[PDB]
A and B are shown apart, each in its own frame.
Chain A
Amino acid sequence: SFLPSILTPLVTLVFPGLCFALFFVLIEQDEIA
């Protein structure tokens, strides 16, 4: 099928990259005032 081509890059490159970006930004968020 075409689901492997559609999903493997989506879930192994785009999603983990966005997760790393989100985690980095969140850990670098400073205290509220």
Chain B
Amino acid sequence: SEFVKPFNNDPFVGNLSTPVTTSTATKLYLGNLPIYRKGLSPLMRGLEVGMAHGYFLIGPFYILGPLRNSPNALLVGLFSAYGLIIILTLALTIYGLASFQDNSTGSNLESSKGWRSFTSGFTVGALGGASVAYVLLNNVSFF
């Protein structure tokens, strides 16, 4: 009872159709993640990715930062998250500039306009997510 078969019935492609690669759970989770979800605009993809990453980026800096044992621990963590997000979106912009040099299609992550929209969504979402995480950690007594 074989469970590892050729990828898309192609023995000569460098891949295997394992349970990890091809199972229904993997397909569902991957295809429903924002980067692969159907119908989402590049702005919406970038926005979702941005809030998801900016929400959790604050935590390492807040807990394990140099000023963890200081009254300004959370503020310093938020500023660190903002700086890291600035670096991340600068990386995104230069990546778009290097990769999608000539393009006129748009509405596609592999085009200049689409990648710019994705980066804009990522920046706004990450800033908002870091701010929301700051608010939650300030009001941690609620939970």
Chain A residues engaging chain B, CB cutoff 8 angstroms: 17, 21, 24-25, 28-30
Residue of A nearest to B101 (CB): A30
CB contacts (< 8 Å) of A28 on chain B: these are 97-99
Q: Among the listed B87, B98, B101, B102, which residue makes an inter-chain contact with A24, where contact means beta carbons less than 8 Å apart?
A: B98
Q: Which of B67-126 contact A (CB under 8 A)?
A: 87, 90, 94, 97-99, 101-102
CA gap between A21 and B89 in the complex, in Å = 12
Which among A17, A21, A30 has the highest number of chain B CB atoms within 10 Å?
A: A21
Partner-A contacts on B (CB < 8 A): 87, 90, 94, 97-99, 101-102
Prevailing SS type, chain A contact patch: helix
Tell me the complex Cα distance, A29–B99, Å.
9
- Complex: how many Å from CA A24 to CA B99? 11
CB distance from A9 to the nearest CB of B (A): 11
